Amino acid sequence: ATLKDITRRLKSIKNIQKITKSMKMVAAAKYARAERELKPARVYSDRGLCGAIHSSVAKQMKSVGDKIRSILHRTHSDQFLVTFKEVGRRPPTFGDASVIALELLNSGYRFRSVISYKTQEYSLANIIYYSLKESTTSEQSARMTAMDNASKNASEMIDKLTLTFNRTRQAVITKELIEIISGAAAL
């Protein structure tokens, strides 16, 4: 439908394709960092677009990470306490992991592979560090493959819209030429 609408739509998805391609390599770069740090860590999130990890965590809880709260707020608000944010851009360290432990005692009160994933003071600091290192490695692998699919799905839309563009391109040339030939005939 119309040559002008196809051009705006084709340009729109072409940009989305390139931007999703960029987020694939950035997620892949963060994944390389995640796998090196997880190797010694086994022996001892806020940013979305990473498959179905946030919902997978919510699966076992009903039956850290601000995006987890977004799902659970309207359903069950009063139960779980604490809450944190700013967890996604920079991976977790001993400094940031230690603050999670402080808001528990001193207070008023998993990565399998690149395309699949499964859901007193010092001892508690160990188990929380293990979980976040498993959580950070799982989301980057998922965001890599999710953005990889987003670019590849956009590429398919670009390919088909390029055909519909060229069909409409030819027809506009043919139709507008027939107007001129019909006009000259009637003189």
């Binding site: 699919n149 590849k152 799905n153 839309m157 088909k160």
Partner: peptide
Amino acid sequence: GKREQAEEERYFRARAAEQLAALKKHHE
């Protein structure tokens, strides 16, 4: 897109198995 269907149909074919898994248990 062609792979627009690939993602969507993969989601609901999985949810079909989950819903049929809930349906078979209630049938017993």
